[PDB]
Scaffold this active site. Structure first.
Site, PDB file in Angstrom:
ATOM      1  N   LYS A  16       9.154   9.181  29.861  1.00  8.44           N
ATOM      2  CA  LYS A  16       8.944   8.722  31.066  1.00  8.44           C
ATOM      3  C   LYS A  16       7.531   7.925  30.998  1.00  8.44           C
ATOM      4  CE  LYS A  16      11.173  12.080  31.410  1.00  8.44           C
ATOM      5  NZ  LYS A  16      11.997  12.415  30.415  1.00  8.44           N
ATOM      6  N   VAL A  20       9.637   4.275  28.122  1.00  8.67           N
ATOM      7  CA  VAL A  20       9.562   4.317  26.505  1.00  8.67           C
ATOM      8  C   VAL A  20      10.980   4.676  26.127  1.00  8.67           C
ATOM      9  CG1 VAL A  20       8.519   5.367  24.341  1.00  8.67           C
ATOM     10  CG2 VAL A  20       7.125   4.952  26.336  1.00  8.67           C
ATOM     11  N   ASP A 126      -6.462  11.496  27.102  1.00  9.43           N
ATOM     12  CA  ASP A 126      -5.373  12.136  27.521  1.00  9.43           C
ATOM     13  C   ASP A 126      -4.605  13.236  26.649  1.00  9.43           C
ATOM     14  OD1 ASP A 126      -3.493  12.266  29.871  1.00  9.43           O
ATOM     15  OD2 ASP A 126      -1.941  11.101  28.848  1.00  9.43           O
TER      16      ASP A 126
HETATM   17  N1  DKI Z   1       5.736   8.246  19.475  1.00 10.97           N
HETATM   18  C1  DKI Z   1       6.770   9.014  20.256  1.00 10.97           C
HETATM   19  N2  DKI Z   1       7.625   9.862  19.503  1.00 10.97           N
HETATM   20  C2  DKI Z   1       8.140  10.442  20.390  1.00 10.97           C
HETATM   21  N3  DKI Z   1       9.197  11.279  20.151  1.00 10.97           N
HETATM   22  C3  DKI Z   1       9.940  12.016  21.038  1.00 10.97           C
HETATM   23  C4  DKI Z   1       9.336  12.495  22.237  1.00 10.97           C
HETATM   24  C5  DKI Z   1       9.849  13.169  23.457  1.00 10.97           C
HETATM   25  C6  DKI Z   1      11.147  13.494  23.073  1.00 10.97           C
HETATM   26  S1  DKI Z   1      11.903  14.218  24.103  1.00 10.97           S
HETATM   27  N4  DKI Z   1      10.990  14.722  25.628  1.00 10.97           N
HETATM   28  O1  DKI Z   1      12.355  15.852  23.739  1.00 10.97           O
HETATM   29  O2  DKI Z   1      13.208  13.826  24.860  1.00 10.97           O
HETATM   30  C7  DKI Z   1      11.697  13.305  21.741  1.00 10.97           C
HETATM   31  C8  DKI Z   1      11.329  12.636  20.949  1.00 10.97           C
HETATM   32  N5  DKI Z   1       7.434  10.443  21.744  1.00 10.97           N
HETATM   33  N6  DKI Z   1       6.568   9.458  21.372  1.00 10.97           N
HETATM   34  C9  DKI Z   1       5.670   9.119  22.207  1.00 10.97           C
HETATM   35  S2  DKI Z   1       4.971   7.814  22.233  1.00 10.97           S
HETATM   36  N7  DKI Z   1       5.377   9.980  23.266  1.00 10.97           N
HETATM   37  C10 DKI Z   1       4.939   9.641  24.525  1.00 10.97           C
HETATM   38  C11 DKI Z   1       4.109   8.779  25.048  1.00 10.97           C
HETATM   39  F1  DKI Z   1       3.194   8.183  24.311  1.00 10.97           F
HETATM   40  C12 DKI Z   1       3.865   8.444  26.482  1.00 10.97           C
HETATM   41  C13 DKI Z   1       4.639   9.041  27.365  1.00 10.97           C
HETATM   42  C14 DKI Z   1       5.632   9.966  27.187  1.00 10.97           C
HETATM   43  C15 DKI Z   1       5.916  10.356  25.446  1.00 10.97           C
HETATM   44  F2  DKI Z   1       6.865  11.275  25.495  1.00 10.97           F
END
Ligand code: DKI
EC number: 2.7.11.1
Lengths: 279, 325
Positions: A16, A20, A126
């Site tokens: 979200k 992303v 953050d």
């Molecule tokens: N660099 C990175 N790798 C991941 N992996 C990830 C994150 C969430 C999930 S989820 N929520 O389980 O679908 C799965 C893989 N998330 N991510 C980042 S940049 N995180 C992120 C962010 F940087 C800003 C908003 C929301 C986010 F979830």
């Protein structure tokens, strides 16, 4: 020039915090997170977005998610980043709570990241359970999207502000000065969150909360927790910014030193989540 | 550690870098001393342990740097260095840069010697692995009033229009950043240029206003406006706002794909249609179109309201247009 749509393939939607996307570098088959920004909408100029990028490229800690460049397609700018397999710490929480030892292991890692950033006169701005990511093998690192240089104000007017005040320090809320020591305070709130599953006052209404943080006494860990945990937290959540330890100083605080374990042993939580979750 | 550790560094470890094959000796061990002694700099050059950047330690240090072209062949090859080492080199350059005596810096005084120290940096823009570092250091020195005059007047200055049009965004961004910081930083020093090099410059600049590339197109169009209302650049604008070539093109940018682009053109468009002493080619092309420009400016982004100053200029432009002659 270098059409990112055919250079990369967007898969599911991930985080979200917008747009992303989990994606694959079609060339190297290596998985990435792609943030796609509008620019036709923006409208916090481009010099802010270009600024937010310049800072990221400066970062190279293995405790903060690696920036892998950006590409322009018409008016939309794909920013590409090191994808972490495990997901958020807040997600990992969904399968049940955490060991004071797993908690400590994380904080030690975050702290390592926070030092790097603090050494380079940058803040994170953050810090919440939500922006703490894990690898498939359990490495803990900071979603770099928070990161920012010390000067010239973070929040301003869009894709910079914090929506939730829960993890916000009191000297931030009062608009006054504020430096890297307001990072510490969030780490404090993050700890309580990692312990209890959500920051102090989640039941409350954000406007009410925001006025309470500076008026009230600081939050404090409550329950079945080793006295040094509770102490670690009060180290952070001191209302006078200078009375809060630096990052390095906290890395030596007994709670961490007694409790942190091998960072590999975190694959427990990835293997639990995996077992717990359908789809 | 003293000047007796800058010698055992620059002569031994540094000068040796540009020589190596694929040895096990200079695999990491020799390149480690290069990197470690740069961290030794930032210790005495910046915050000494806990305390502040020493005034004691610099006196018997800064002079030993100018000893030979020690920062010449340092810049004449990177990548082979270090990531966090590049970061130091940048800041090492950028903290002794402000070392000052009276009200003048010994840095500037002994940079202005063999000035090919700067030609290297701009040329670093084509090496993608360093391009950003070079710009970081470059902006920090074109920051000084006497320092920037060196580059501005260059022949290989006009290389920027190829740099700015580089594919890799972050470099094509950082390029436009040095571009700007020159034509702005020193308002007096800048006005010197645009008059003596109007013909070559604005034919090159016009290339940009076409390229799309949403960003290159935008920033350039925006930087145009700033340079015209500069008022140290009053001579240059009256010159530019005269060719009908320029006004013809603006008119079409207002018909652009993009909302933000249209509005950003309206900011150079108005300047044409506001000149007290409008020349004949402008007045001719305005009258020729007058009839159906009012048709355009009737419905032009009618939602930004919000912006009185926009609408106050809106009616003002239709006055000029409708009133002539
Ligand atoms: N660099 C990175 N790798 C991941 N992996 C990830 C994150 C969430 C999930 S989820 N929520 O389980 O679908 C799965 C893989 N998330 N991510 C980042 S940049 N995180 C992120 C962010 F940087 C800003 C908003 C929301 C986010 F979830």
């Amino acid at each position: 020039m270098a059409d990112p749509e055919e250079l990369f393939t967007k898969l599911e939607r991930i985080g979200k915090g917008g747009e992303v996307f989990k994606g694959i570098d079609n060339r190297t088959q290596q998985v990435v997170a792609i943030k796609i920004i509008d620019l036709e909408e923006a409208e916090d100029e481009i010099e802010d977005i270009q600024q937010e990028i310049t800072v990221l490229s400066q970062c190279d800690s293995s405790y903060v998610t690696k920036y892998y460049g950006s590409y322009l397609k018409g008016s939309k700018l794909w920013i590409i980043m090191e994808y972490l397999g495990g997901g958020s710490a807040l997600d990992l929480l969904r399968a049940g709570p955490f060991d004071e030892f797993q908690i400590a292991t994380m904080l030690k890692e975050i702290l390592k990241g926070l030092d790097y950033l603090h050494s380079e006169k940058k803040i994170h701005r953050d810090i919440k359970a939500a922006n703490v990511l894990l690898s498939e093998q359990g490495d803990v690192k900071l979603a770099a999207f928070g990161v920012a240089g010390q000067l010239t104000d973070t929040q301003i007017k869009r894709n910079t502000f914090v929506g939730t005040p829960f993890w916000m320090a009191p000297e931030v809320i009062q608009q006054s000065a504020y430096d890297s020591k307001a990072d510490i305070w969030s780490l404090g709130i993050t700890a309580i969150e990692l312990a209890k599953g959500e920051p102090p006052n989640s039941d409350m209404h954000p406007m009410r909360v925001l006025f309470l943080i500076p008026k009230n006494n600081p939050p404090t860990l409550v329950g079945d927790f080793t006295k040094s945990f509770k102490e670690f937290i009060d180290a952070c959540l001191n209302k006078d910014p200078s009375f809060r330890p630096t990052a390095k100083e906290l890395l030596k605080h007994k709670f961490i030193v007694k409790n942190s374990k091998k960072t590999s042993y975190l694959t427990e939580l990835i293997d639990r989540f995996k077992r717990w979750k359908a789809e | 550690a003293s000047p007796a550790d800058i010698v055992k560094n620059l002569k031994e470890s540094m000068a040796v870098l540009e020589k190596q094959d694929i040895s096990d000796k200079k695999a990491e061990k020799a390149t480690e001393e290069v990197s470690k002694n740069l961290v030794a700099m930032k210790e005495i050059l910046y915050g000494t342990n806990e305390k502040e950047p020493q005034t004691e330690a610099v006196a018997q240090l800064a002079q030993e740097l100018y000893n030979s072209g020690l920062l010449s062949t340092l810049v004449a090859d990177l990548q082979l260095i270090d990531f966090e080492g590049k970061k130091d080199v940048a800041q090492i350059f950028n903290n002794i840069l402000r070392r000052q005596i009276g009200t003048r810096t010994p840095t500037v005084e002994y940079i202005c010697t063999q000035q090919n120290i700067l030609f290297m940096l701009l040329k670093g823009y084509e090496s993608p692995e360093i391009a950003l570092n070079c710009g970081i250091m470059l902006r920090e020195c074109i920051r000084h009033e006497p320092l920037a005059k060196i580059i501005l007047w260059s022949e290989q200055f006009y290389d920027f229009f190829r740099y700015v049009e580089m594919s890799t965004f972050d470099i094509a961004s950082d390029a436009f950043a040095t571009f700007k910081d020159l034509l702005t930083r020193h308002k007096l020093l800048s006005a010197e240029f645009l008059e003596q090099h109007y013909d070559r410059f604005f034919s090159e600049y016009e290339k940009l206003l076409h390229s799309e590339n949403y960003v290159t197109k935008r920033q350039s169009l925006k930087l145009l406006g700033e340079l015209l209302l500069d008022r140290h650049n009053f001579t240059i604008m009256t010159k530019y706002i005269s060719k009908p070539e320029n006004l013809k093109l603006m008119m079409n940018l207002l018909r652009d794909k993009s909302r933000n682009i249209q509005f950003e053109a309206f900011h150079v468009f108005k300047v044409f249609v506001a000149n007290p002493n409008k020349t004949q080619p402008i007045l001719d092309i305005l009258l020729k179109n007058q009839a159906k420009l009012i048709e355009f400016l009737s419905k032009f982004q009618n939602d930004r309201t919000e912006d009185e100053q926009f609408n106050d200029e809106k009616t003002y432009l239709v006055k000029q247009i409708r009133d002539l002659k």
